[PDB]
Coordinates of C-alpha atoms in Angstrom, one line a residue:
Chain A
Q1 CA 12.6 -33.3 28.1
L2 CA 12.7 -29.4 28.3
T3 CA 13.8 -28.5 31.9
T4 CA 14.6 -25.1 34.1
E5 CA 17.4 -24.8 36.7
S6 CA 17.3 -21.5 38.7
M7 CA 21.0 -20.1 39.6
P8 CA 21.2 -20.0 42.2
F9 CA 17.5 -21.2 43.5
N10 CA 17.7 -19.2 47.1
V11 CA 18.7 -15.7 45.7
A12 CA 19.8 -12.5 48.3
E13 CA 17.7 -9.3 47.6
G14 CA 19.3 -7.1 45.4
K15 CA 21.4 -9.6 43.1
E16 CA 20.9 -12.0 39.9
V17 CA 19.6 -15.1 39.0
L18 CA 19.9 -17.2 36.1
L19 CA 17.1 -19.7 35.3
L20 CA 19.3 -22.1 32.5
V21 CA 17.3 -24.5 30.1
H22 CA 18.4 -27.8 29.9
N23 CA 16.9 -30.0 26.7
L24 CA 16.3 -27.3 24.4
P25 CA 15.6 -28.2 20.9
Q26 CA 17.9 -27.1 18.3
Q27 CA 15.1 -26.6 16.1
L28 CA 12.9 -23.7 17.1
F29 CA 10.7 -20.6 16.0
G30 CA 10.5 -19.5 19.2
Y31 CA 9.6 -19.1 23.0
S32 CA 8.2 -17.3 26.2
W33 CA 9.1 -16.6 29.7
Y34 CA 6.5 -16.4 32.3
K35 CA 4.9 -15.0 35.8
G36 CA 3.8 -18.2 37.7
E37 CA 2.8 -22.2 36.8
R38 CA 1.1 -22.2 33.6
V39 CA 1.2 -20.4 30.1
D40 CA -0.7 -17.3 30.7
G41 CA -0.4 -14.1 27.7
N42 CA -1.7 -11.6 30.9
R43 CA 1.9 -13.2 32.6
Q44 CA 4.7 -13.3 29.9
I45 CA 7.4 -11.7 30.7
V46 CA 9.1 -11.5 27.5
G47 CA 8.6 -13.1 23.9
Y48 CA 11.6 -14.1 22.0
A49 CA 11.7 -15.1 17.9
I50 CA 14.0 -16.9 16.3
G51 CA 14.2 -15.1 12.9
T52 CA 13.4 -11.6 14.2
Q53 CA 15.5 -11.9 17.2
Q54 CA 13.2 -9.8 18.5
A55 CA 13.0 -10.3 22.3
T56 CA 9.1 -8.6 22.9
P57 CA 8.6 -8.2 26.2
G58 CA 5.4 -8.5 27.9
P59 CA 3.0 -7.2 30.7
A60 CA 4.7 -9.2 33.6
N61 CA 8.5 -7.4 32.9
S62 CA 10.1 -5.7 35.0
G63 CA 12.8 -4.0 32.8
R64 CA 15.6 -6.3 34.9
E65 CA 15.3 -9.9 32.5
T66 CA 17.9 -10.2 29.8
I67 CA 17.0 -13.3 27.5
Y68 CA 19.3 -15.4 25.4
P69 CA 19.6 -17.6 22.4
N70 CA 19.8 -20.9 25.2
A71 CA 16.7 -19.9 26.2
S72 CA 18.0 -19.1 29.7
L73 CA 16.6 -15.9 31.9
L74 CA 18.9 -13.4 33.8
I75 CA 16.9 -11.7 36.8
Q76 CA 19.0 -8.6 37.7
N77 CA 18.7 -6.0 41.0
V78 CA 16.1 -8.9 42.0
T79 CA 13.3 -8.0 44.6
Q80 CA 11.0 -9.5 46.7
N81 CA 8.5 -9.9 44.5
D82 CA 10.1 -12.0 41.9
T83 CA 9.2 -15.0 44.6
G84 CA 8.0 -17.5 43.2
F85 CA 7.2 -20.0 40.3
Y86 CA 8.3 -19.4 36.0
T87 CA 7.3 -21.1 32.9
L88 CA 9.2 -21.5 29.6
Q89 CA 7.1 -22.4 27.0
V90 CA 9.3 -23.1 23.5
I91 CA 7.8 -23.8 20.3
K92 CA 9.9 -25.6 17.7
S93 CA 10.2 -25.3 14.0
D94 CA 7.1 -27.9 13.1
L95 CA 4.6 -25.8 15.9
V96 CA 4.7 -28.5 18.6
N97 CA 5.7 -27.0 22.1
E98 CA 7.3 -28.4 24.8
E99 CA 6.6 -26.9 28.8
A100 CA 8.9 -26.4 31.9
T101 CA 9.0 -24.5 34.5
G102 CA 11.0 -23.4 37.1
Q103 CA 11.5 -21.3 40.6
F104 CA 13.6 -19.5 42.6
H105 CA 13.4 -18.0 46.0
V106 CA 14.6 -14.6 47.4
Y107 CA 15.6 -13.6 50.6
Chain B
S1 CA -4.0 5.3 -51.9
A2 CA -7.5 4.4 -51.1
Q3 CA -8.0 0.3 -50.5
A4 CA -4.4 0.4 -49.2
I5 CA -5.5 2.4 -46.0
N6 CA -8.5 1.2 -45.7
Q7 CA -7.2 -2.5 -46.2
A8 CA -4.5 -2.0 -43.0
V9 CA -7.6 -0.5 -40.5
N10 CA -9.3 -4.2 -41.1
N11 CA -6.6 -5.6 -40.6
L12 CA -5.6 -3.7 -37.2
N13 CA -9.3 -3.7 -36.3
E14 CA -10.0 -6.9 -37.0
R15 CA -6.7 -7.7 -34.5
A16 CA -6.8 -5.7 -31.8
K17 CA -11.3 -7.3 -31.1
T18 CA -9.5 -10.4 -31.2
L19 CA -6.7 -9.5 -29.0
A20 CA -8.8 -7.5 -26.4
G21 CA -12.4 -9.1 -26.6
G22 CA -11.0 -12.8 -27.4
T23 CA -10.7 -15.4 -25.1
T24 CA -8.8 -18.9 -26.6
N25 CA -7.0 -16.4 -29.3
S26 CA -5.8 -13.4 -27.0
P27 CA -2.5 -13.6 -25.9
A28 CA -3.5 -10.6 -23.4
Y29 CA -5.8 -12.5 -22.2
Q30 CA -3.8 -16.0 -21.6
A31 CA -1.3 -13.8 -20.8
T32 CA -3.5 -12.5 -17.4
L33 CA -5.2 -15.9 -16.9
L34 CA -1.6 -17.1 -16.6
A35 CA -0.7 -14.8 -13.9
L36 CA -3.9 -15.3 -11.8
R37 CA -3.2 -19.3 -12.2
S38 CA 0.4 -18.8 -11.1
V39 CA -0.7 -17.1 -7.4
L40 CA -3.5 -19.9 -7.1
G41 CA -1.1 -22.1 -8.1
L42 CA 1.8 -20.3 -5.9
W43 CA -0.5 -21.0 -2.5
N44 CA -1.7 -24.8 -3.0
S45 CA 2.0 -25.3 -3.7
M46 CA 3.5 -23.6 -0.4
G47 CA 0.6 -21.5 1.4
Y48 CA 0.0 -24.8 4.3
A49 CA 3.2 -23.7 5.4
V50 CA 3.1 -20.5 5.8
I51 CA 2.8 -19.6 9.6
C52 CA 0.1 -17.6 11.1
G53 CA -1.4 -16.0 13.7
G54 CA 1.2 -14.3 15.9
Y55 CA -0.3 -11.5 18.1
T56 CA -1.1 -7.5 17.4
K57 CA -1.5 -6.3 20.2
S58 CA -1.0 -8.1 23.1
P59 CA 0.2 -11.8 24.3
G60 CA -3.0 -11.8 26.3
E61 CA -4.9 -11.9 23.4
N62 CA -4.9 -15.8 23.0
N63 CA -7.0 -15.0 19.1
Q64 CA -6.9 -17.8 17.1
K65 CA -8.4 -18.2 13.6
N66 CA -9.0 -21.7 11.9
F67 CA -9.8 -20.8 7.9
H68 CA -11.3 -23.4 5.8
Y69 CA -10.7 -24.6 2.2
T70 CA -13.8 -26.8 0.6
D71 CA -13.7 -29.5 -1.8
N72 CA -11.9 -33.6 1.0
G73 CA -11.6 -30.0 2.4
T74 CA -8.5 -28.8 4.9
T75 CA -8.3 -26.0 7.4
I76 CA -5.7 -24.1 8.5
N77 CA -5.3 -22.5 12.1
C78 CA -4.0 -19.8 12.6
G79 CA -2.7 -18.6 16.8
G80 CA -2.8 -22.3 18.3
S81 CA 0.0 -24.7 18.4
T82 CA 0.1 -28.7 19.6
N83 CA 1.5 -30.3 22.7
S84 CA 3.9 -32.9 22.9
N85 CA 1.2 -35.9 23.6
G86 CA -0.3 -34.2 20.3
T87 CA -3.7 -32.6 22.0
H88 CA -4.4 -28.6 20.7
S89 CA -3.1 -25.6 22.8
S90 CA -4.8 -22.2 22.3
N91 CA -1.5 -20.6 23.5
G92 CA 1.3 -21.4 20.1
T93 CA 1.9 -18.7 17.4
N94 CA -0.1 -16.2 19.5
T95 CA 2.4 -15.8 22.3
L96 CA 4.6 -14.3 19.7
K97 CA 4.7 -10.6 18.1
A98 CA 3.3 -11.0 14.2
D99 CA 5.9 -8.9 12.4
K100 CA 8.5 -9.1 9.3
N101 CA 10.1 -12.6 8.8
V102 CA 8.5 -14.4 11.7
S103 CA 4.2 -15.1 11.6
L104 CA 1.4 -13.5 9.6
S105 CA -1.3 -12.0 12.4
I106 CA -4.7 -13.3 11.5
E107 CA -6.2 -10.3 9.9
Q108 CA -3.1 -11.0 7.4
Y109 CA -4.0 -14.5 6.9
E110 CA -7.9 -13.3 6.5
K111 CA -7.0 -11.4 3.6
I112 CA -5.2 -14.2 2.0
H113 CA -7.8 -16.3 2.3
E114 CA -10.2 -14.0 1.2
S115 CA -8.8 -12.9 -1.7
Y116 CA -7.9 -16.6 -2.7
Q117 CA -11.6 -17.8 -2.6
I118 CA -12.9 -14.6 -4.7
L119 CA -10.3 -15.3 -7.4
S120 CA -10.9 -19.3 -6.6
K121 CA -14.3 -18.8 -6.9
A122 CA -14.3 -16.1 -9.6
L123 CA -12.9 -18.0 -11.9
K124 CA -14.6 -21.7 -11.8
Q125 CA -17.9 -19.9 -11.3
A126 CA -17.3 -17.3 -14.2
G127 CA -14.0 -17.4 -15.4
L128 CA -11.7 -14.6 -16.5
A129 CA -14.0 -11.9 -18.3
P130 CA -13.1 -10.6 -21.7
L131 CA -10.0 -7.4 -21.1
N132 CA -12.5 -5.5 -23.1
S133 CA -15.9 -6.3 -21.2
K134 CA -16.0 -4.8 -17.7
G135 CA -17.0 -8.2 -15.8
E136 CA -19.8 -10.4 -14.5
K137 CA -20.9 -9.7 -10.5
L138 CA -21.1 -12.9 -8.7
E139 CA -20.8 -13.9 -4.7
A140 CA -18.2 -16.0 -3.3
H141 CA -18.1 -17.5 -0.4
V142 CA -15.8 -17.5 3.0
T143 CA -15.4 -20.1 5.2
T144 CA -13.2 -19.7 8.4
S145 CA -14.2 -20.3 12.4
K146 CA -13.4 -19.2 15.6
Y147 CA -13.7 -21.2 19.4
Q148 CA -16.2 -19.8 21.8
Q149 CA -15.4 -19.6 25.5
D150 CA -14.9 -23.1 26.9
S151 CA -17.8 -24.7 24.5
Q152 CA -17.9 -25.6 20.4
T153 CA -16.4 -24.0 17.5
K154 CA -18.6 -20.9 16.0
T155 CA -18.5 -21.9 11.5
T156 CA -19.1 -18.4 9.7
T157 CA -19.5 -18.0 5.8
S158 CA -19.5 -14.8 4.2
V159 CA -20.9 -13.5 1.4
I160 CA -19.0 -11.5 -1.0
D161 CA -20.1 -9.6 -3.4
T162 CA -17.4 -9.5 -6.4
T163 CA -16.8 -9.7 -10.1
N164 CA -14.9 -11.5 -12.2
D165 CA -12.9 -9.1 -14.4
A166 CA -9.2 -8.9 -15.2
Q167 CA -8.7 -5.2 -12.8
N168 CA -10.4 -7.3 -9.3
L169 CA -9.0 -10.2 -10.2
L170 CA -5.5 -9.3 -10.5
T171 CA -5.7 -6.9 -7.1
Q172 CA -6.9 -10.6 -5.2
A173 CA -3.9 -12.2 -6.6
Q174 CA -1.9 -8.9 -6.1
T175 CA -2.6 -9.1 -2.5
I176 CA -1.9 -12.3 -2.2
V177 CA 1.5 -12.3 -3.4
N178 CA 2.8 -8.8 -1.5
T179 CA 1.6 -10.5 1.6
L180 CA 4.1 -13.0 1.3
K181 CA 6.3 -10.8 -0.3
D182 CA 6.8 -7.6 1.9
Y183 CA 6.2 -10.0 5.5
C184 CA 8.2 -12.6 4.7
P185 CA 6.2 -15.2 7.3
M186 CA 8.2 -18.3 8.5
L187 CA 7.6 -21.6 7.3
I188 CA 6.8 -24.8 9.1
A189 CA 9.1 -27.5 9.3
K190 CA 8.9 -31.4 9.8
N191 CA 5.0 -37.1 1.1
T192 CA 7.2 -34.0 2.0
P193 CA 7.6 -31.7 -0.8
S194 CA 11.7 -31.1 -1.6
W195 CA 11.8 -27.7 -0.6
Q196 CA 9.9 -27.7 3.3
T197 CA 12.8 -30.7 4.5
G198 CA 12.7 -24.7 4.9
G199 CA 12.3 -25.2 8.2
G200 CA 14.1 -22.7 10.5
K201 CA 13.9 -20.6 7.1
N202 CA 11.2 -17.8 6.2
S203 CA 8.8 -18.1 3.2
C204 CA 11.2 -14.8 1.5
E205 CA 14.5 -17.4 1.9
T206 CA 13.3 -20.4 0.0
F207 CA 10.5 -18.6 -2.4
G208 CA 12.0 -14.7 -3.2
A209 CA 12.7 -15.5 -6.4
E210 CA 9.3 -17.6 -6.7
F211 CA 7.6 -14.3 -5.3
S212 CA 9.6 -11.7 -7.1
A213 CA 7.9 -13.8 -10.6
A214 CA 4.7 -13.5 -9.4
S215 CA 4.7 -10.3 -8.7
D216 CA 6.6 -9.1 -12.2
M217 CA 3.3 -11.5 -13.4
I218 CA 1.2 -9.5 -11.9
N219 CA 2.3 -6.3 -12.5
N220 CA 2.7 -6.9 -16.5
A221 CA -0.9 -8.6 -16.5
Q222 CA -2.1 -5.1 -15.1
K223 CA 0.0 -3.3 -17.7
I224 CA -1.8 -5.6 -20.0
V225 CA -5.4 -4.4 -18.8
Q226 CA -4.3 -1.1 -19.3
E227 CA -3.1 -0.9 -22.9
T228 CA -5.7 -2.5 -23.6
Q229 CA -8.3 -0.2 -22.5
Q230 CA -6.3 2.4 -24.2
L231 CA -6.2 -0.1 -27.2
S232 CA -9.8 0.2 -27.4
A233 CA -10.4 4.0 -26.9
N234 CA -8.3 4.4 -30.7
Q235 CA -10.5 2.3 -33.5
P236 CA -9.2 4.1 -36.6
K237 CA -12.6 4.6 -39.0
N238 CA -12.5 3.3 -42.7
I239 CA -12.6 5.8 -45.0
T240 CA -15.7 6.4 -46.4
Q241 CA -16.3 8.6 -49.8
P242 CA -12.8 8.0 -50.7
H243 CA -12.7 10.7 -53.3
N244 CA -13.9 13.8 -51.0
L245 CA -11.4 15.9 -50.4
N246 CA -14.0 18.0 -48.6
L247 CA -14.9 15.2 -46.1
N248 CA -11.4 13.2 -46.4
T249 CA -9.6 16.5 -46.2
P250 CA -5.9 16.2 -44.9
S251 CA -6.1 16.8 -41.2
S252 CA -8.5 14.1 -41.0
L253 CA -6.5 11.7 -42.8
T254 CA -3.1 12.8 -40.9
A255 CA -5.5 12.4 -37.6
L256 CA -6.6 8.9 -38.4
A257 CA -3.1 7.7 -39.5
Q258 CA -2.0 9.1 -36.5
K259 CA -4.7 7.2 -34.9
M260 CA -3.2 3.5 -36.2
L261 CA -0.2 4.1 -35.2
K262 CA -1.0 4.0 -31.4
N263 CA -3.3 1.5 -31.9
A264 CA -0.6 0.0 -33.1
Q265 CA 2.0 0.5 -30.7
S266 CA -0.5 -0.4 -28.1
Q267 CA -0.6 -4.0 -29.4
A268 CA 2.8 -3.9 -29.6
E269 CA 3.5 -3.5 -26.3
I270 CA 1.2 -5.6 -25.2
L271 CA 2.8 -8.9 -26.7
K272 CA 5.8 -7.4 -25.2
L273 CA 4.4 -7.6 -22.1
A274 CA 3.0 -10.7 -22.8
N275 CA 5.9 -12.6 -23.5
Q276 CA 7.4 -10.8 -20.3
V277 CA 4.6 -13.0 -18.3
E278 CA 5.8 -16.0 -20.2
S279 CA 9.4 -15.1 -19.4
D280 CA 8.4 -14.5 -15.4
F281 CA 6.3 -17.8 -15.4
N282 CA 9.7 -19.6 -16.4
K283 CA 11.2 -17.9 -13.6
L284 CA 8.3 -18.8 -11.1
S285 CA 8.1 -22.6 -12.1
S286 CA 11.5 -23.2 -12.2
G287 CA 13.0 -23.7 -8.9
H288 CA 11.7 -25.0 -6.1
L289 CA 8.2 -25.2 -7.2
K290 CA 9.2 -27.1 -10.9
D291 CA 7.7 -30.4 -9.8
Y292 CA 4.8 -29.1 -8.0
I293 CA 3.0 -26.1 -9.1
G294 CA 2.0 -27.6 -12.8
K295 CA 0.3 -30.7 -11.8
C296 CA -2.8 -31.9 -9.4
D297 CA -3.2 -35.1 -7.9
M298 CA -4.6 -36.0 -4.3
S299 CA -1.3 -36.1 -1.8
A300 CA -1.8 -37.0 2.0
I301 CA 0.8 -34.3 3.4
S302 CA -0.2 -32.9 6.5
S303 CA 1.4 -30.2 9.5
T304 CA 0.2 -29.8 12.3
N305 CA -2.0 -26.6 12.5
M306 CA -3.9 -28.4 9.5
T307 CA -7.0 -31.2 10.0
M308 CA -8.6 -32.8 6.9
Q309 CA -12.0 -34.0 5.8
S310 CA -10.7 -37.3 4.5
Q311 CA -7.0 -38.3 3.8
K312 CA -6.4 -36.8 0.8
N313 CA -6.3 -33.2 0.1
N314 CA -4.5 -31.0 -2.8
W315 CA -1.9 -29.1 -0.6
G316 CA 1.7 -29.6 -2.4
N317 CA 0.9 -29.3 -5.8
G318 CA -0.9 -26.1 -8.1
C319 CA -3.7 -27.4 -8.8
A320 CA -4.5 -24.6 -11.0
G321 CA -3.8 -25.4 -14.4
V322 CA -1.0 -23.1 -15.3
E323 CA 0.5 -25.6 -18.3
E324 CA -3.2 -25.7 -20.0
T325 CA -3.1 -22.1 -20.2
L326 CA 1.1 -21.8 -20.7
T327 CA 0.8 -23.6 -24.2
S328 CA -2.9 -21.7 -24.7
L329 CA -0.8 -18.2 -24.4
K330 CA 2.3 -19.8 -26.7
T331 CA -0.5 -20.7 -28.9
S332 CA -2.4 -17.8 -29.0
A333 CA 1.4 -15.6 -29.9
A334 CA 2.1 -18.1 -32.0
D335 CA -0.4 -16.7 -34.5
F336 CA -0.1 -12.9 -33.4
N337 CA 3.9 -13.6 -34.2
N338 CA 2.4 -14.7 -38.0
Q339 CA 0.3 -11.7 -38.7
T340 CA 3.2 -9.0 -37.1
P341 CA 4.5 -8.6 -41.3
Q342 CA 0.3 -6.9 -42.0
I343 CA 1.0 -5.0 -38.5
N344 CA 4.4 -3.7 -40.3
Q345 CA 3.1 -2.7 -43.3
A346 CA 0.2 -0.8 -41.4
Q347 CA 2.4 1.2 -39.5
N348 CA 4.9 2.3 -42.7
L349 CA 1.2 3.0 -44.8
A350 CA 0.5 5.9 -41.6
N351 CA 4.3 7.1 -41.4
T352 CA 4.4 8.2 -44.8
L353 CA 1.6 10.7 -44.1

């Protein structure tokens, strides 16, 4: 099953954090990252299509995020606002989706 | 001489009236019909796999739209996904932006659907109108559905006033091919046709040759239409009062003869194009769609964004009757390839003056 891992979990302010994705499906249409607990278009950080490799940012995009083909999400110059849950929706080639949530705290 | 020129005119006119006005005897008509049936066959053979419903404006608009194909009916959902457990999700393709080599927007899909239904309904209710004829009016129905706010699904059938003339129907076919050709939406992976096992690849990667083929069949068919109208307004008249030199002056006689040559060259150009449609069909129908586009029997193939009315449907293969029309093009062109000597005498006879 799809799984997030924040590296590190406890992040100092102004430093960086990487959300690692474990058990990513090998056949993908695309995926998207979100602020908070659930898949909400209004809190989309960024969307990535496998066909074009277009990291199209969303409303939750602070401009300090970097997304990778392995579904990992780097966040640099982390502010106190960046605390809390994040959600990854992945969409497979057969149009079946898998959700996974992550979290880190900032101090 | 008198009746020599007069007999050659009667050969051109009777051949032209068959080529322009005829249906089963006309290779211009059967080539046009082949191009129209080929695009219907294209969409029936691989249309279900086209990924649609990527967002235009925002991820915050999680728009979906179901598009209906009726009979053993089916329904295609643009926008949604299906979850790991099997339930429908309103968050799917609409989470990712629609463009080239990714996903069609609902708008781009609804154009394909609308054109497909117009084309399909027009050919079934009225057939293709003769190329010289201006066409016959007919209503077309387009059924779709949207999901209401935390409640039921609303169905909506649109009425479209349309005609069965070639120019209109070719525009509908052109809309389908060019949308696929220009934007290359990705195909769904997973009775699976050979080409699909085409999962992590766009539709132009799998069907680039087939889109180019269909694209040319349409453009060549549109050219046949434009030559047929040019032909139709270019009829050489019979010589009457054969020895009245004031009436039949050596000015109007050279003009008549030059009207016959433009009439002759139009007929040559139409049959040339009709063969290139037959050539372009062979390119279309001998790649990934070889064992599919020509045939029709009830399969039971399904993707995660399709629901069906029974356990049948006709996706995967063409169901357009393209083989019927291919042989009819050949049979009609054979008649016209036998009368080419009578034409060649009429070209030489006119050139003399």
